[PDB]
Design a protein around this ligand. Structure first.
Ligand code: PA7
Length: 225
């Protein structure tokens, strides 16, 4: 277990994003789904050049799960996943060149009254908007080139640890949101299914929500797109 501070610019970026989307919190789920989609594209593109790419997990899905009792929301993809060093660098620092650009266009647009939600989506920085609804964000990731690890943060710092549960994802990433008290509605299946549907019509991968039929109850993955 290693402890880390966020880079200064990521602290600023977190605040810009939270402020930009404060009255549209639900866009957090849009961005998590987009990130999962990009991750599935990446492994799909890798499988064109590497016969083993999918060996760790033969599926390509996004699977969402509400856990009312533990107050958790889980967004799981079987995409490319992240190595330990990518968990640290990609989430904890300004890692790409596009991210800096985003910082400039965001502040210029935000002073000029121009729309910013598109900026967040364009540059793929929406991960941080999970903090509008969660007190704790947890990222479990398994990448073909590393062992499974857990990233966790309350936004005031983050830590990364080897997952003691070993390789349970096979390949891919689970974003786990410890929801704020004011965000318990994101644990309701009807809420989540409408949002998931709303945000997944463009995803070139199937997206499922763990749902109940129903005194007899049957739970199963329900395709959303
Ligand atoms: C740039 C703003 C924060 N950085 C990310 O979201 C990056 O983290 C990684 N990331 C986030 N969610 C991911 C996922 N589900 N699978 C793989 N990488 C992911 C991607 O490299 C994103 O560019």
């Amino acid at each position: 277990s290693e402890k880390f501070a966020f880079q200064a610019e990521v602290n600023r970026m977190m605040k810009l994003i939270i402020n930009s989307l404060y009255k549209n919190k639900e866009i957090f789920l849009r961005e998590l789904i987009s990130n999962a989609s990009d991750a599935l594209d990446k492994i799909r593109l890798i499988s064109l050049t590497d016969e083993n790419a999918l060996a760790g997990n033969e599926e390509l899905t996004v699977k969402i799960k509400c856990d009312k009792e533990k107050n958790l929301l889980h967004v799981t993809d079987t995409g490319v996943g992240m190595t330990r060093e990518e968990l640290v660098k990609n989430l904890g620092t300004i890692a790409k060149s596009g991210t800096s650009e985003f910082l400039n266009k965001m502040t210029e647009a935000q002073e000029d009254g121009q729309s910013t939600s598109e900026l967040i989506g364009q540059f793929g920085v929406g991960f941080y908007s999970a903090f509008l609804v969660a007190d704790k964000v947890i990222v479990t990731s398994k990448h073909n080139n590393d062992t499974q690890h857990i990233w966790e943060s309350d936004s005031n710092e983050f830590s990364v640890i080897a997952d003691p549960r070993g390789n349970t994802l096979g390949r891919g990433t689970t974003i786990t949101l410890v929801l704020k008290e004011e965000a318990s509605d994101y644990l309701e299946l009807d809420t989540i299914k409408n949002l998931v549907k709303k945000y997944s019509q463009f995803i070139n991968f199937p997206i499922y929500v763990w749902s109940s039929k129903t005194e007899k109850t049957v739970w199963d993955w329900e395709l959303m797109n």
